[PDB]
Symmetry: D2
Subunit: 115 residues, 4 copies
């Protein structure tokens, strides 16, 4: 698993479940080509987005639909979505965990990049 | 102003100075149109991006060039930029402060929204 | 001032108003001695805690009463308080802004340290 | 495992390894009684701090020695430590994960409280 996303809810102290997101790769014409998507599990995680062979160097965007999440909970949110844009694999294949911590008017995101 | 951005550096315990950012507004055809741009001051703040009359209802994107910031300090960071996308003024005019706290592999962003 | 605290609320997108906090300083015998206290203003800020002459070198603790804040909004939060412990003025006088962003199950805190 | 602590490094994008911490419970005389401690693993996690029977309702403090961590890396840090003080089990036994994300002049902490 070269890429995993984990989403937590700072209001409820829980994984953020059923959060949709899309992953894009930056094309040669500077546009965003969709390539993977999913929604978070009961543990707030999304696995199996890509494979080692497919996940080549490039610029990637993860667009997390935080607005629909807060809407489902009846809370008015600030952001349309949370976006995480990064260059991958600049020194060869790494495992990437992108974590996002969500509040109605704030989000934080961190990357844990390991072997 | 109706829109201000404040950026702090969590590694050095300081404002994040001379950070470039571009603001965009979503057009009727769903494209991002340039709206304003600027760089943070010595206090890590960027003021004067817009006016109450120009800052109409809509979806706005602030793209903060965090990568250039870190690269200039010798650091290769994780993110290309920090992106803040929000609907503004949907229930009448508001004042918006977007705050961002930066680390090489993490950032946090919050908004303070006040009624004029 | 040499010491200011700013508190924001991540649930409401606002300053965190009327938040109580107590500042302590470590004594020679390793106990925490009361140093100053106050509550945040409508802008979520607490100023005037100390002076440059009183704010000598030492280890300081700011205990922010985040639980009472959330309870007054109807929320049962995770933390009892947010605690910020730091050595101050070790290399001569500095100005310290302690910032905290609050959510019911999370908080973040950063410092801005500037040379007078 | 009723209580787990996970520590991440926001400068390096990695688990924060070998970070020491102590856990205290608030005594009847308003003082902090030590009861558990450890250091984080290669995954930045500390498990096995307590058991279901021992981890009764009360006020708990986790004192994370972030200053020694940054010192080992040659980076001057702001905080003496990061402290997490919470009331446990107020509605019966829950599993608690305390996460802390560290930078030299900042830390964030979140709780994920599940079944
Ligand atoms: C639980 C942490 C995420 C995480 C969980 C399991 C993992 O294997 C992992 O690598 C990261 C999360 C809370 C860390 C974190 C703390 C604070 C933050 O602001 C943030 O963006 C992320
Ligand atoms: C709002 C920032 C502080 C601030 C200083 C001066 C201002 O006029 C202001 O509006 C905000 C910032 C420190 C808030 C913040 C954002 C994100 C965080 O993670 C955090 O801990 C704190």
């Amino acid at each position: 698993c070269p890429l995993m996303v984990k989403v937590l809810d700072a209001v409820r102290g829980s994984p953020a479940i059923n959060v949709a997101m899309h992953v894009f790769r930056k094309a040669a014409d500077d546009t965003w080509e969709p390539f993977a998507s999913g929604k978070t599990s009961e543990s707030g995680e999304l696995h199996g987005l890509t494979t080692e062979e497919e996940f080549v160097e490039g610029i990637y965007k993860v667009e997390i639909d935080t607005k629909s999440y807060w809407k489902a909970l009846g809370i008015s949110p600030f952001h349309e979505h949370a976006e995480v844009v990064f260059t991958a694999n600049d020194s060869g294949p790494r495992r990437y965990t992108i974590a996002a911590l969500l509040s109605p008017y704030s989000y934080s995101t961190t990357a844990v990049v390991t072997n």
